[PDB]
Design a protein around this ligand. Structure first.
Ligand SMILES: Nc1nc2c(ncn2[C@@H]2O[C@H](COP(=O)(O)CP(=O)(O)O)[C@@H](O)[C@H]2O)c(=O)[nH]1
Ligand SMILES: [Ca+2]
Ligand SMILES: [Ca+2]
Ligand SMILES: [Ca+2]
Ligand code: NA
Ligand code: NA
Length: 210
């Protein structure tokens, strides 16, 4: 079934090549139907993110060991402006919209990922490392090609899995070139309902349904 707009759910990613949740983001459902799930991640929301086992930031670990060193999780608020996330059921990416203060639209962000799986409390995925940035002038470029390369070097991905990610990348680029959904759909002009509260991080944010 579908969640009513205004519902609170969790949007989650598992650790790379493991079963445990490492990213958990409480979000408000904007739209949920057979064609699209859209959610709003508000500024200040309490989230879960990965850190290295010593609590230090993943991004600061050299690439050579960034994906080999032991990790844990940390609660942290969503910094900066809120993000709108959009995902077609069954599709191997979601598209997130980023704005600067004053709702100055910055870019669409194509997050290549395992198609979201729905469960009672939200949606779960696995990030595929490679991303795409799309600018308001319709141009585009890759992000994190080097992290994608590193992940395959460390066996976080098979040649076959990597191939599937590259295929997804080509399909997303095809949509960008054609200016299809959701790029063409004016979500850059969407605004959250000011009455919506900031959703809480559930104490059981890490539960994994069978
Ligand atoms: N406003 C805001 N943006 C965030 C936050 N965390 C992460 N992001 C953004 O989400 C983007 C993707 O996160 P990542 O770099 O950890 C991963 P990946 O590139 O594989 O999706 C980052 O570039 C970062 O800017 C946050 O708390 N607030
Ligand atoms: Ca990503
Ligand atoms: Ca990335
Ligand atoms: Ca990145
Ligand atoms: Na469908
Ligand atoms: Na203002």
């Amino acid at each position: 079934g579908h969640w009513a707009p205004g519902s609170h759910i969790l949007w989650r990613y598992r650790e790379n090549g493991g079963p445990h949740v490492h990213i958990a983001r409480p979000v408000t459902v904007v739209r949920d139907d057979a064609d699209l799930l859209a959610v709003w991640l508000a500024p200040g929301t309490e989230c879960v993110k990965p850190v290295l086992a010593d609590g230090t930031p993943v991004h600061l670990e050299p690439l050579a060991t960034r994906y080999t060193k032991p990790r844990t999780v940390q609660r942290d608020q969503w910094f900066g402006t809120g993000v709108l996330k959009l995902a077609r059921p069954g599709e191997a990416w979601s598209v997130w919209l980023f704005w600067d203060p004053g709702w100055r639209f910055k870019n669409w962000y194509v997050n290549l990922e395992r198609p979201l799986t729905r469960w009672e409390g939200g949606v779960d995925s696995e990030d595929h490392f490679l991303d795409i940035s799309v600018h308001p002038d319709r141009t585009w470029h890759w992000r994190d090609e080097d992290e994608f390369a590193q992940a395959l070097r460390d066996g976080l991905m098979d040649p076959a899995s990597a191939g599937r990610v590259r295929r997804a990348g080509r399909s997303a680029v095809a949509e960008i070139r054609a200016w299809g959904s959701p790029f063409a759909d004016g979500w850059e002009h969407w605004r959250p309902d000011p009455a919506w509260p900031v959703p809480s991080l559930p104490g059981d944010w890490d539960r994994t349904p069978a």
